[PDB]
Structures are given as C-alpha cells and as structure tokens.
Chains A and B, each alone.
Chain A
Amino acid sequence: AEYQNIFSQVQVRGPADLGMTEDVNLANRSGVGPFSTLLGWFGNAQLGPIYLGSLGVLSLFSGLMWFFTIGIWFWYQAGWNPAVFLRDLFFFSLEPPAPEYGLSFAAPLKEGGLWLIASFFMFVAVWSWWGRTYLRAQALGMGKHTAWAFLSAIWLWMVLGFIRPILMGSWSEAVPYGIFSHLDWTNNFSLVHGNLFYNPFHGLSIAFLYGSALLFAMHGATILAVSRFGGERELEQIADRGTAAERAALFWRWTMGFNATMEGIHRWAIWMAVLVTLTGGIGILLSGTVVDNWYVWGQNHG
C-alpha cells in the first residue's frame, strides 16, 4: 500500500520548544511537561508549557468550584456511598429553583441555591477563559478570530443558561447539571415548543453541524492528500502558492466546478462552524419568548 499519512512512521525529537516570545510575560509560563510518544504517532509529542497568569488562575479555580459544587451534590444524592456514586452517576442531577422563585436568589441550598452557585462559578470560568483567548492572541500579535469564534459558542450557552431564563422570568427554565437529566431537558424542550424540527433556526443549525463534518472531512482529506507536497504548511502556501495548493484547488474545481484558496478555505471553515451555534442560539432564544409552538408558527409563516 501507499503510506497514507494518518499516523507517522518515524518520530523525531529535539530540545523542548519553549515557544515564541513576542509580548508575552514569560514569568507566567510553566516549564515543559513530559513528551508522549503515544500522542506523537498522531500529533505533536510535547506537552506544555502552559501560560497561567491571574485570569488563568481565576478561570481554573472557578471551573473547579463549578465541578466541586456539582460533585458535592452528587455524593450527597449517592448517600456518601462510592458504589452508589459510580452506579447511579448519570442519574444524579443538580436542578435549578422551582418556578415559584422566579429570578430571585431566595431558594434553599438543597432546592435551587446550589444550582445558582454552580452557575455563578461556570459564568466566571467561561468568561475569564474567553478573556484568555483574546489576551493570549494579543500578546502574540495575532488576530482575534479565536476569541470571536469562541463567543459564538458562548452565545448558545448564555442563551440556554442565562438570557432565556431571565427573559422568561425564572431560573426554572435553565438547564440542570446532570448527564441524563440534561438530555431529558433537551427532549422536553422540543415537545413543549411543538417540535424543534419546525424551528427554521434549528434546521439551519443542523445544516451547519452536518456541514462542518462535510467540510472538515473535505479539508482534512484534501490537506493529507497533498501532504506529499507540503500541503499542511498552510501559512507559507498562503504567502507563496505551491503545487500543493494548486492540486488541492484543481481537485475540487474538476469535481464540483469551483474551489477555494489556502487562506480562503479557512474562512469557509470558521463560518461553517460558528453558524452552528449562532443560528442555534437564535432558535432557542425565540422559543417561548416570541414563539410557543414551532409547528403552529410554521403554519402561519410559510
């Protein structure tokens, strides 16, 4: 067989790569972690260094407190018994306050308060992490596309957990922290809003989610197909088009009649992905605020 370049045949290693400096405060980088020959068959073998300034510490601490809060509730539900905790793991659930409390913070700990504490910590963890994505880009002189992309994911999450509950008048509308309980929530949400397949924004969100799989299979396959000419060196193919970039375009021109460039395919990419959650969040936000029943709505609007 031709070698297909999914796994490497030979690994080479050199001194740990401590990274570019540009404007980064080096006092906040760790040393390098270990090298993993296991990862190195597929990607880079090197772990670390990681940058952890104050916003990183904040984000991690908060993320851990989100997790500790949920886990405390789970162990309690398990009667402090480890066997039960493992047995029933996917069944435990930290549930928001009852409708009766609206948007207040008056609910007892065992019945809503703990949920708010958990959400509080999640909110801090995510937004400070969002800040990290901007700031690490800025220190390296780079564009802010990652932070802008991450924001599209934040959008769905904010809508589900915070914006839509606030607009509906109660925390009882937010999502519970539990593996099965959150799946039950999702299912119920569709039923109660007359079936999300009738929400055109849900349909679009699916188009994009499937489309992202289509597109990354296309793109990943294409780059690997032209790796025998250095295709994965995309930045330098952008700066100085090579026969990798030309064979890649012409594959697609000849197949489907049009094609991308090495830079441009990344723009099709970022947008296919980001529109999953952008359209998704619109779809959800409209549900029960403006549209109670997508079936019904669809009968009156095409």
Chain B
Amino acid sequence: ALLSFERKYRVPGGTLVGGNLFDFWVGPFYVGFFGVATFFFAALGIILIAWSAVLQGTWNPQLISVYPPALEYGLGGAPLAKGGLWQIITICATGAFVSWALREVEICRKLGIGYHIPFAFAFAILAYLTLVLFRPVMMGAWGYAFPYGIWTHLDWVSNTGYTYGNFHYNPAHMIAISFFFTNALALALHGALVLSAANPEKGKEMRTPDHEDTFFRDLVGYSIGTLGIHRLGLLLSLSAVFFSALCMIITGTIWFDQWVDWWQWWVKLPWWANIPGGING
C-alpha cells in the first residue's frame, strides 16, 4: 500500500548494483540488491544465533548468549561451539549493517536527497566495529570483544570498565558523555521549541520561526536558528559516538593502567608539582 503522495516518487533508477533486477518494493520497504544482501546476512545471523542457543541449551532471550572465543585462541578461528559461531555472526552482523547503509544510499539516489543519513549511520557501525573488530585486533584476541547477550553484554561493560578502575576517569569518555548529555538537552529543546510554535496557546495563530528565535534570545541571549539546530543535533550525536569509539580504541592499547592515574601528568607539571598545600601536597 502507498502513502497518499508516494506514487510520484516510485520511479526506476538509483540502484548501485544490478540495474533494475531488484528495483522494487515489498509493501513499504524498498528492496534493491542491498535489501537482498541485508536479508541474507540477517537471516544467516539469526539462524546461527538460534543454533548457538541450542548448544547453550536454552531458548530464553534473556539467557541466550553468544560469546567470542576465549583469549587462548588469539586472532585465529575457533570451533563453532566455542567461539566460531560468534566469529561468523559478527561477519553476518557487519555485512547486514553495511548492506543496510548502502541500501540507504540507493534510497537517497532514487529520492534525489543528500547522503547525510547513511553517513551518520556509518558512525554507529564504526563504533560497533571498534568494539568487536578493531580493538580486539589491536589487543591480539577476539575474546576482548563483547558477547551477544542481553544481560551478558552488560556484564562485559562492567568488567571491562573496572579493569581500568572507575572508567569515569577516561578523558575521551568524559568528552563522549558530555556530547551525549548535551545531545539529549538539544533534542528536548528542539522538539519543545517547534511544538511550542506549532501548538501555541488556545485560540492563537501558529507562531513563526521568528517567534522561535525570539524565545531563545529572550531566554539565553542567543539563537542558533533552524538550520543551525539540525546541524547541531547531527554534530552532537555523531561527536558523542566518535569520542565513544576513541575512548575505547585507546583503552587496553595505548593506555591500560588505572584511568585515575592518567591525570597525574597535569598535577606533576614542574611549575606547580611541588608547591605545598591543596589536595596533592
């Protein structure tokens, strides 16, 4: 079925691979060669997960967990039951995410729009690949990756953090958090702002973008503007993920001691290192 305004946009073209072979929809979904790739990788993935479930001996989704090979395997392959399936499922996962991004590119091309969405998405994928691929390769073993399980992956977050003390003290991690919290602040403000203008007090006319600038200037002395704010949200959220990837790519590789102790470089600068008093003298 189609949206009321949709038909005029469902023209041939835009595909990256296959000409018109896969230029069609199933219901609302565009297919394309990357739709077929996505389905294949996802489908194989889910089947391997399900099989892993069988070898774990559970079907509870709060218990199913697929763990990477143990550290002893290094960066080699492992038997299916003992890490192999994780390695295959990771390849399927990566294949599905990239296929999804590339399908998104095909959709942009057909729609005549910019490529900003899949570009943004590629940041998420790179964050994923940092945890399951790049970091483990630099650390020399797949077993440093997180396992695929609803709760078991949370165990991995917590064990990995406490390996370096309170992980709060990772400076890239502080920046990352700042971007996340700022992004959510920006999202609340923007949603509230547009809605406040579209849904004014009872009986009154819709406000204008000019009212939106006025509100913010009245409140904080500045307005970023309607282009600005969409640029901002995109920057805040992509920066949050970039710094997340960064904060983990350095952990266990260039820095692997307790993160609190990193801050001693500042405290020990020579001009104040030995001045008495304060917390550190």
- Chain A interface residues (CB < 8 Å from chain B): 2, 4-6, 17, 19-20, 22, 24, 29-30, 33, 42-44, 46-51, 77-79, 81, 83-88, 90-92, 132-133, 136-146, 148-150, 152-153, 180, 183-184, 186-187, 195, 197, 208-209, 212-228, 232-235, 238-239, 241, 246-251, 253-255, 257-259, 263, 266-274, 276
Q: Tell me whether A84 and B277 are in contact (CB under 8 A).
A: yes
Q: Tell me whether A232 and B217 are in contact (CB under 8 A).
A: no
In the complex, which residues of chain A have a beta carbon less than 8 angstroms from the beta carbon of B185? 153, 273
Q: Tell me whether B191 and A266 are in contact (CB under 8 A).
A: yes
In the complex, which residues of chain B have a beta carbon less than 8 angstroms from the beta carbon of A235? 194, 197-198, 206-209, 212
Q: Tell me whether A51 and B218 are in contact (CB under 8 A).
A: yes
Q: Tell me whether B117 and A50 are in contact (CB under 8 A).
A: no
Q: B27 an interface residue at 8 Å Cβ cutoff?
A: yes
Given contacts A33-B221, A253-B28, contact A43 B228 (CB under 8 A): yes
**A29 CB to closest chain B CB, in angstroms?**
7
In the complex, which residues of chain B have a beta carbon less than 8 angstroms from the beta carbon of A258? 28
A20 to B237, CA, bound (A): 31
SS class of chain B's interface: helix, strand, loop or mixed? helix
**B166 CB to closest chain A CB, in angstroms?**
5
A266 to B187, CA, bound (A): 9
Q: B72 an interface residue at 8 Å Cβ cutoff?
A: no
Closest residue of A by beta carbon distance from B26? A257
**A140 CB to closest chain B CB, in angstroms?**
5
Given contacts A143-B200, A246-B9, contact A213 B237 (CB under 8 A): yes
Q: B5 an interface residue at 8 Å Cβ cutoff?
A: yes
Closest residue of A by beta carbon distance from B220? A50
Given contacts A87-B280, A197-B154, A234-B226, contact A137 B196 (CB under 8 A): yes
Q: Tell me whether B188 and A88 are in contact (CB under 8 A).
A: no
Q: Tell me whether B278 and A77 are in contact (CB under 8 A).
A: yes
In the complex, which residues of chain B have a beta carbon less than 8 angstroms from the beta carbon of A6? 231, 234-235
Q: Tell me whether A20 and B211 are in contact (CB under 8 A).
A: yes
Binds A, one of B51-59, B89-97, B131-139, B261-269: B261-269
In the complex, which residues of chain A have a beta carbon less than 8 angstroms from the beta carbon of B263? 90
In the complex, which residues of chain A have a beta carbon less than 8 angstroms from the beta carbon of B276? 79
**B79 CB to closest chain A CB, in angstroms?**
31
A244 to B201, CA, bound (A): 28
List 6 other contacts, CB 8 Å, given A87-B275, A214-B237. Answer: A212-B180, A212-B237, A217-B233, A225-B117, A239-B206, A257-B27
A132 to B237, CA, bound (A): 28
A238 to B206, CA, bound (A): 10
In the complex, which residues of chain B have a beta carbon less than 8 angstroms from the beta carbon of A136? 215, 218-219
In the complex, which residues of chain B have a beta carbon less than 8 angstroms from the beta carbon of A273? 184-185, 187-188, 191
In the complex, which residues of chain B have a beta carbon less than 8 angstroms from the beta carbon of A254? 25, 28-30, 107
A195 to B236, CA, bound (A): 29
A81 to B275, CA, bound (A): 9
Q: Tell me whether A141 and B200 are in contact (CB under 8 A).
A: yes
Q: Tell me whether B114 and A5 are in contact (CB under 8 A).
A: yes
**A28 CB to closest chain B CB, in angstroms?**
9
Given contacts A6-B231, A183-B168, contact A132 B191 (CB under 8 A): no
Q: Give the residue among B116, B154, B166 with the most A Cβ atoms within 10 A.
A: B116
**B209 CB to closest chain A CB, in angstroms?**
6
Q: Which 8 A-B pairs rank lowest in CB-CB distance, beginning with the nearest?
A: A43-B228, A79-B277, A220-B234, A270-B191, A269-B191, A50-B221, A43-B224, A273-B188
A222 to B118, CA, bound (A): 10
**B51 CB to closest chain A CB, in angstroms?**
27
Q: Tell me whether B218 and A19 are in contact (CB under 8 A).
A: yes
In the complex, which residues of chain B have a beta carbon less than 8 angstroms from the beta carbon of A48? 217, 221-222
Q: B192 an interface residue at 8 Å Cβ cutoff?
A: yes
Q: B81 an interface residue at 8 Å Cβ cutoff?
A: no
Closest residue of A by beta carbon distance from B238? A217
**B271 CB to closest chain A CB, in angstroms?**
7
Q: B42 an interface residue at 8 Å Cβ cutoff?
A: no
A153 to B217, CA, bound (A): 21
Q: Tell me whether B186 and A216 are in contact (CB under 8 A).
A: yes
Q: Tell me whether B3 and A225 are in contact (CB under 8 A).
A: no
In the complex, which residues of chain A have a beta carbon less than 8 angstroms from the beta carbon of B228? 42-44
Q: Tell me whether B279 and A91 are in contact (CB under 8 A).
A: yes
In the complex, which residues of chain B have a beta carbon less than 8 angstroms from the beta carbon of A276? 184
Q: Tell me whether B240 and A79 are in contact (CB under 8 A).
A: no
Q: Tell me whether B269 and A87 are in contact (CB under 8 A).
A: yes
For this complex, 16 residue pairs linking A to B, each with C-beta atoms less than 8 Å apart, are A2-B115, A19-B217, A42-B232, A43-B225, A140-B218, A142-B215, A145-B191, A187-B168, A216-B234, A227-B114, A235-B212, A246-B9, A247-B113, A251-B111, A255-B103, A273-B184
Q: Tell me whether A219 and B192 are in contact (CB under 8 A).
A: no
Q: Tell me whether B188 and A209 are in contact (CB under 8 A).
A: no
- What 0/1 readout, one digit per residue, does chain B (172-204) give for beta carbons within 8 Å of chain A? 000000001101111111111111111111001
In the complex, which residues of chain A have a beta carbon less than 8 angstroms from the beta carbon of B219? 50-51, 132-133, 136
